Amino acid sequence: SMNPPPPETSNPNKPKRQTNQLQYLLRVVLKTLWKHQFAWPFQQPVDAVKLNLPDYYKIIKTPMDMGTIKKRLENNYYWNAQECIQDFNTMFTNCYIYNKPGDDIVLMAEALEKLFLQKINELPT
Numbered sequence: 001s002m003n004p005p006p007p008e009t010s011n012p013n014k015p016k017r018q019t020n021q022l023q024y025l026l027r028v029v030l031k032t033l034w035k036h037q038f039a040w041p042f043q044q045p046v047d048a049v050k051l052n053l054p055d056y057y058k059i060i061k062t063p064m065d066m067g068t069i070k071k072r073l074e075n076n077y078y079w080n081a082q083e084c085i086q087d088f089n090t091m092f093t094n095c096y097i098y099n100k101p102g103d104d105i106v107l108m109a110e111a112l113e114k115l116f117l118q119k120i121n122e123l124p125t
């Protein structure tokens, strides 16, 4: 397929954890970003067949999206907040990598990344 399987949202080999910061990442950070007007391209894995981006996964080797992040948070997949934050950063950087400066999709990611940074500036103790 043009599409690889989506990133795992569970892994029985990997230990689970719940922290105040991870709870906040789901309840506040993810769920607020999700409602932003520019969130829609990032709410699910890129479907290269649907979107006619046959080279997407030829270029992007560590795909990530907020649908996956949401499911990971719901499943207590992450060890800590930093691990989850890394997934958001991978999502943004993928967008900058696959596209180019000034593209509409990049303007969208830029705005979401700013809002994301505002929200993770302070996490609960």
Ligand SMILES: O=C(Nc1cc(-c2csc(=O)[nH]2)cc(S(=O)(=O)NC2CCCC2)c1)C1CC1
Residues within 6 Å of the ligand: 040, 041, 042, 044, 046, 051, 094, 095, 098, 099, 104, 105, 108
């Ligand atoms: O996701 C959707 N559409 C969609 C997503 C992308 C995209 C997500 S991550 C990335 O790098 N690109 C891109 C497109 S596009 O080819 O049609 N370009 C558009 C997107 C915004 C500005 C130009 C579409 C719908 C939710 C499933």
